[PDB]
Amino acid sequence: YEHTAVIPNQVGFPYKAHVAREGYSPLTLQMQVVETSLEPTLNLEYITCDYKTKVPSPYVKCCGTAECRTQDKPEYKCAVFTGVYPFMWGGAYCFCDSENTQMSEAYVERADVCKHDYAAAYRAHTASLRAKIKVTYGTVNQTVEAYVNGDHAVTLAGTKFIFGPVSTAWTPFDTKIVVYKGEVYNQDFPPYGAGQPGRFGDIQSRTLDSKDLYANTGLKLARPAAGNIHVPYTQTPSGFKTWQKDRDSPLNAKAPFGCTIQTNPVRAMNCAVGNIPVSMDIADSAFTRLTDAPIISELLCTVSTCTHSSDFGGVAVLSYKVEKAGRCDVHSHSNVAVLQEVSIEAEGRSVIHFSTASAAPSFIVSVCSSRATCTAKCEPPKDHVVTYPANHNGITLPDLSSTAMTWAQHLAGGVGLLIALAVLILVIVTCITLR
Amino acid sequence: YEHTAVIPNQVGFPYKAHVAREGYSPLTLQMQVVETSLEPTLNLEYITCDYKTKVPSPYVKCCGTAECRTQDKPEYKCAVFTGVYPFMWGGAYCFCDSENTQMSEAYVERADVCKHDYAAAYRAHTASLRAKIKVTYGTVNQTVEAYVNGDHAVTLAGTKFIFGPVSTAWTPFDTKIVVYKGEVYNQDFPPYGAGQPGRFGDIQSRTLDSKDLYANTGLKLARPAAGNIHVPYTQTPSGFKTWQKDRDSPLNAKAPFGCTIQTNPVRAMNCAVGNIPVSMDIADSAFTRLTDAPIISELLCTVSTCTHSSDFGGVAVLSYKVEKAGRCDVHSHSNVAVLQEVSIEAEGRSVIHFSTASAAPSFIVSVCSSRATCTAKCEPPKDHVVTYPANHNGITLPDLSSTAMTWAQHLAGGVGLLIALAVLILVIVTCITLR
Structure with a gap:
């Protein structure tokens, strides 16, 4: 099976990509x-x-x-x-x-x-x-x-x-x-x-x-x-x-x-500077079919702690009901926060680290073929100078539902509202003046 | 003395250019x-x-x-x-x-x-x-x-x-x-x-x-x-x-x-394909000053024979009164016909060959610093296939005074004329209808 991807040209930096073939379990590669x-x-x-x-x-x-x-x-x-x-x-x-x-x-x-x-x-x-x-x-x-x-x-x-x-x-x-x-x-x-x-x-x-x-x-x-x-x-x-x-x-x-x-x-x-593209011809004896693929359902993710900051300063737990032991694979499908470890362990609760340079992230994560979401609110660190760089993309944009801009729809809807009584109370007499 | 020119990039083809310094006799170079x-x-x-x-x-x-x-x-x-x-x-x-x-x-x-x-x-x-x-x-x-x-x-x-x-x-x-x-x-x-x-x-x-x-x-x-x-x-x-x-x-x-x-x-x-430019830094011991420069006046050129065709098929004679023997230089100052020889001989009558791919040429030629003209009418050859190419520029355009388009001014002047009685005989009553 063949695949294509792009990787950023900067020394000492993780990047990871998939295949999702059909039938088989997923597989996650990392390039560095x-x-x-x-x-x-x-x-x-x-x-x-x-x-x-x-x-x-x-x-x-x-x-x-x-x-x-x-x-x-x-x-x-x-x-x-x-x-x-x-x-x-x-x-x-x-x-x-x-x-x-x-x-x-x-x-x-x-x-x-x-x-x-x-x-x-x-x-x-x-x-x-x-x-x-x-x-x-x-x-x-x-x-x-x-x-x-x-x-x-x-x-x-x-x-x-x-x-x-x-x-x-x-x-x-x-x-x-x-x-x-x-x-x-x-x-x-x-x-x-x-x-x-x-x-x-x-x-x-x-x-x-x-x-x-x-x-x-x-x-x-x-x-x-x-x-x-x-x-x-x-x-x-x-x-x-x-x-x-x-x-x-x-x-x-x-x-x-x-x-x-x-x-x-x-x-x-x-x-x-820049990006270098990569393409892939992948062999077949490096997958797992279904026999040692565990079945995992009702996934629920929470959060406890975050900073911005420059390293792995966000922690989350996971909850799931198991049926068989083994080893699954993890990924977050958005560009706002990259995970750390490449394969979670089997049965119980398990934690994952991540980093994100934004005020309030929300993304969707999937240990194996079932999917889930979990979001959080964050706060800045008290430092100014670090010795080691750049363990995130560098995108600090607002979400679609934060504390910050839940304020935004009320004001824009509020200013959107008071013209609406103004527009019709114009018209309701505008008919009757053609008596 | 320095000079600039351009020469066409095609194997086996003559091209020639001047200097005309001041005082001295002219000098003609050829490049091939x-x-x-x-x-x-x-x-x-x-x-x-x-x-x-x-x-x-x-x-x-x-x-x-x-x-x-x-x-x-x-x-x-x-x-x-x-x-x-x-x-x-x-x-x-x-x-x-x-x-x-x-x-x-x-x-x-x-x-x-x-x-x-x-x-x-x-x-x-x-x-x-x-x-x-x-x-x-x-x-x-x-x-x-x-x-x-x-x-x-x-x-x-x-x-x-x-x-x-x-x-x-x-x-x-x-x-x-x-x-x-x-x-x-x-x-x-x-x-x-x-x-x-x-x-x-x-x-x-x-x-x-x-x-x-x-x-x-x-x-x-x-x-x-x-x-x-x-x-x-x-x-x-x-x-x-x-x-x-x-x-x-x-x-x-x-x-x-x-x-x-x-x-x-x-x-x-x-x-x-194309043209290659050339520039020139010319020494001084390759001119003639005036001492062995002959004086030539009342130049008169005629013609006897032409074809188009693909080689040196146009001949002309020259007439001039001499005062001293020597060797002068020849050139035709237009792009419609190129000459053959690089230096005429002294006293008497002498002939020059040329080639031209047009119906009726006219140009100005000058063995030494006096100038003259001579024109001709021409006819096509009876052949279709030659073995050796292209001894002319390749410009077949009409002249400003030929048998062909002396017909042109009579028709255009004739059609230019009959509107001219029409235009005024309009106007001569156009005043009197404001009585």
């Missing part, structure tokens, strides 16, 4: 989710890391001028300076005093710590999500992991579960994210090869091995001092290690629905 | 596409292949009953049969005649030819397309491959081409396709684990190595014969090799626009 991942799809676009310069050992030859040659490496700049007269440690270096010339070169490369430390960019797309559900009934506790796009079945002892696709598939990401060591950000990074100096994305590369760079930090070469040997050097300072101290607040603090992150693969867990 | 791919994005969901059964060697022990054990493998079924008395080759097997018992088991696994022969499912999404364009002008023949999403530049000798994104990005695919060996189909396959026996998708698996199956073919075990040794066996026949003889017509025969397929990666080629 324990985990909910989420996963987008990525494709890399570039990386960045810190860099380092090199100034390899400038060249002097005296009374003979120069010429330097070009060569392939990113951001190579050579220069040529006339009229230099150094003065090294031992004495004066060489004496062809007026006509001396000197060259200089330097370049930029990646540092030695890039293959442990980098900050990469990415791009997002449509995403899929998977859940873990604990389902119990009959004589069996089981749990099951499942994809949520509507194609993946799974086998319990004879039964098939396939899940509805989604309510809606929005995500707490937009199209461009950037990931650096255990938290994800939300930037808008420059495209490629257009990083102006100083800010983020100053050194690019695709997949992190080698051979290709991009570097525009504005190298210029300056004139050396009067009577020394060094190489001067001028540069706007680096762009990576000026980002990781004056940064932002991360995305682990402005996530919308409690949606927590941890990422060697990027995820978003326990994210609590 | 030779190939057009298309490519969607995929993600695998399951596969299927043929299967095979195994019946490993049933067990007898006599005057001692049985018990078989369960074990983990897909679709394992064991049985137990009482009162069997076999009779093997040599004589009677064993003699504990009344109390004998016998067991049987069998299972299902994948065959030996799955890693050369399978049929997988997939899913489609948004797609991107790339083209190959031959562009020529000046003194240069070149071709260039290019992405069509508006981000990818490309370098000729100094110039930059970037292409407009798309007209629209529909595809000849819907969201679920299934691929088997060189042609793609269009099915609607069951989700996962819900394949009822006999039809497609009877054995599933994700990525094709091992360890996980799904199999529901309805194995049952039957009673062995009276006095033999075999294992009976009953099964609805396989689902894969009942699909590949009674199949469908494939998608290589109902593709919409001539869109042909071949697929180790899935593609769709030469697919002829």
